[PDB]
Amino acid sequence: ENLYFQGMKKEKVEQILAEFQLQEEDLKKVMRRMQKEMDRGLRLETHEEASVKMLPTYVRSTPEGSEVGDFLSLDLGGTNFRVMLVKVGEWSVKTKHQMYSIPEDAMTGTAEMLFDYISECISDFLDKHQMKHKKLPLGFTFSFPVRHEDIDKGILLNWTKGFKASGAEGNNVVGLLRDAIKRRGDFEMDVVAMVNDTVATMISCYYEDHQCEVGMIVGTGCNACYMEEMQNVELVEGDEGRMCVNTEWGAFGDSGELDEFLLEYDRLVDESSANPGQQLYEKLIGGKYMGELVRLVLLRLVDENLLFHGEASEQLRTRGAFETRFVSQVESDTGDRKQIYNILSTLGLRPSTTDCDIVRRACESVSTRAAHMCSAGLAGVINRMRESRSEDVMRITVGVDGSVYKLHPSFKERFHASVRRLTPSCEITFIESEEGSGRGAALVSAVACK
Numbered sequence: 232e233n234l235y236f237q238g239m240k241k242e243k244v245e246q247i248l249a250e251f252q253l254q255e256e257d258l259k260k261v262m263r264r265m266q267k268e269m270d271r272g273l274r275l276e277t278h279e280e281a282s283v284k285m286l287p288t289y290v291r292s293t294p295e296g297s298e299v300g301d302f303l304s305l306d307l308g309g310t311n312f313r314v315m316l317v318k319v320g321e322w323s324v325k326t327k328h329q330m331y332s333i334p335e336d337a338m339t340g341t342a343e344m345l346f347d348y349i350s351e352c353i354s355d356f357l358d359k360h361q362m363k364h365k366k367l368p369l370g371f372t373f374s375f376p377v378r379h380e381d382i383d384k385g386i387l388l389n390w391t392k393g394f395k396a397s398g399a400e401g402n403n404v405v406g407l408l409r410d411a412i413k414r415r416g417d418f419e420m421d422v423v424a425m426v427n428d429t430v431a432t433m434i435s436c437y438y439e440d441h442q443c444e445v446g447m448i449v450g451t452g453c454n455a456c457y458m459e460e461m462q463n464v465e466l467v468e469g470d471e472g473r474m475c476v477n478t479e480w481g482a483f484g485d486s487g488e489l490d491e492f493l494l495e496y497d498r499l500v501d502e503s504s505a506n507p508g509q510q511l512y513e514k515l516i517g518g519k520y521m522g523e524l525v526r527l528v529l530l531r532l533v534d535e536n537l538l539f540h541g542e543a544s545e546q547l548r549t550r551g552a553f554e555t556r557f558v559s560q561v562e563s564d565t566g567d568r569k570q571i572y573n574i575l576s577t578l579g580l581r582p583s584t585t586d587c588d589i590v591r592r593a594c595e596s597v598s599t600r601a602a603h604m605c606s607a608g609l610a611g612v613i614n615r616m617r618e619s620r621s622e623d624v625m626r627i628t629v630g631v632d633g634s635v636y637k638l639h640p641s642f643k644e645r646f647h648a649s650v651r652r653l654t655p656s657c658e659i660t661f662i663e664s665e666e667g668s669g670r671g672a673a674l675v676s677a678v679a680c681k
């Protein structure tokens with residue numbers, strides 16, 4: 232209750248939190264470095280060495296012919312596994328849907344276990360809606376880096392976001408799925424398309440706004456896709472029209488590009504992750520890591536005797552116990568500290584009013600940096616598109632999905648303002664996808680099956 236000492240503690244906390252600050256000049260440097268890696272990823276000469284893969288998706292502008300009817304859309308990679316029945320006409324409407332929690336033994340076991348579980352979920356969905364005998368074209372949203380040979384054929388480059396199933400990396404993902412369906416043998420599907428989640432988001436948003444040519448995810452992980460000129464897509468023969476490119480920007484920094492900005496907290500999260508040294512840019516933004524970064528900031532403040540009387544509870548010293556959703560909930564607190572108190576009390580802590588305020592500042596520090604780093608990536612893509620299109624003023628729509636962008640109380644606002652400062656002569660409209668994956672994957676499958 233000594234207000235002079237409370238102020239001195241908050242001042243020391245501010246000196247430590249200041250490390251998270253990124254000036255406009257730092258963001259421009261990250262943006263330019265991102266653009267240099269994007270150029271590298273698209274070229275035949277430097278693609279293999281590029282950290283940002285810029286993977287061709289085989290999704291094109293003006294696809295021509297499209298089929299109508301019932302489509303099954305799958306989604307693996309986000310939160311849980313989703314199966315959706317989509318009706319495509321003229322339009323595209325989600326008619327039926329089911330989500331399945333993936334057992335930990337299937338995300339880190341064998342690819343056979345994972346794909347067997349996926350096939351079991353498909354069998355369950357078809358029974359709940361009496362359609363197992365019906366052979367529908369299937370579209371698969373698969374949220375991982377894939378080197379495509381075509382819309383329905385592509386190899387998994389590597390798992391990300393903690394996935395580790397053996398026997399998948401280097402294999403045709405559509406083949407892994409088709410093989411698992413065949414081993415079960417209680418239904419038949421024509422797997423016609425595979426798309427990244429950024430791609431499915433862009434397409435579902437494009438359906439509502441034809442100026443949408445960028446898709447971005449800020450959920451468990453962070454990535455973006457955009458419509459590139461075919462002349463710039465050196466990995467695909469042809470120079471007419473546009474093709475969607477999956478940047479896989481989460482791997483920016485994997486070649487040392489973010490070294491000067493990485494803090495001790497980033498090094499610890501990276502070292503304890505399933506993929507050390509990989510997805511470094513994603514680890515600064517994604518919901519799989521955000522809460523954990525705050526947890527490590529709190530432990531440093533506990534160690535400096537600036538928080539919780541210099542004592543950390545068993546829960547606070549537990550990996551993953553400071554959930555990303557707590558970061559959003561802390562920053563939603565009205566000022567009375569009730570929401571912050573609840574989270575901290577549940578974590579086995581006995582927080583003071585000052586402890587609550589410090590935890591809020593730690594959350595703001597990590598989430599603001601996530602918003603700012605993300606903004607440099609999106610600004611790099613948009614600025615590159617304006618330049619490639621020889622546009623004086625580019626008016627574009629960005630379709631977005633993911634829990635961090637959608638649910639965090641201020642990330643969106645901080646992110647938009649920073650993107651806008653970095654994108655002179657661009658008019659950017661941001662739209663949130665409404666059941667993004669399913670509709671997007673079905674529209675792609677409708678074209679793919681002729």
Ligand SMILES: Cc1ccc(NC(=O)[C@H](CC2CCCC2)n2ccc(C(F)(F)F)cc2=O)nc1
Binds near residue numbers: 289290382434
């Ligand atoms: C194998 C293959 C190859 C190309 C494609 N391309 C499409 O489906 C494009 C993608 C869009 C074009 C620019 C942004 C993304 N698309 C998607 C939906 C709609 C609509 F909403 F009208 F139904 C119109 C449309 O043209 N799909 C499959």
Ligand SMILES: OC[C@H]1O[C@H](O)[C@H](O)[C@@H](O)[C@@H]1O
Binds near residue numbers: 309373429451
């Ligand atoms: O789910 C968001 C993103 O997560 C990881 O970055 C994946 O590598 C990427 O494919 C996906 O788009």
Ligand code: NA
Binds near residue numbers: 461463465467
């Ligand atoms: Na090309």
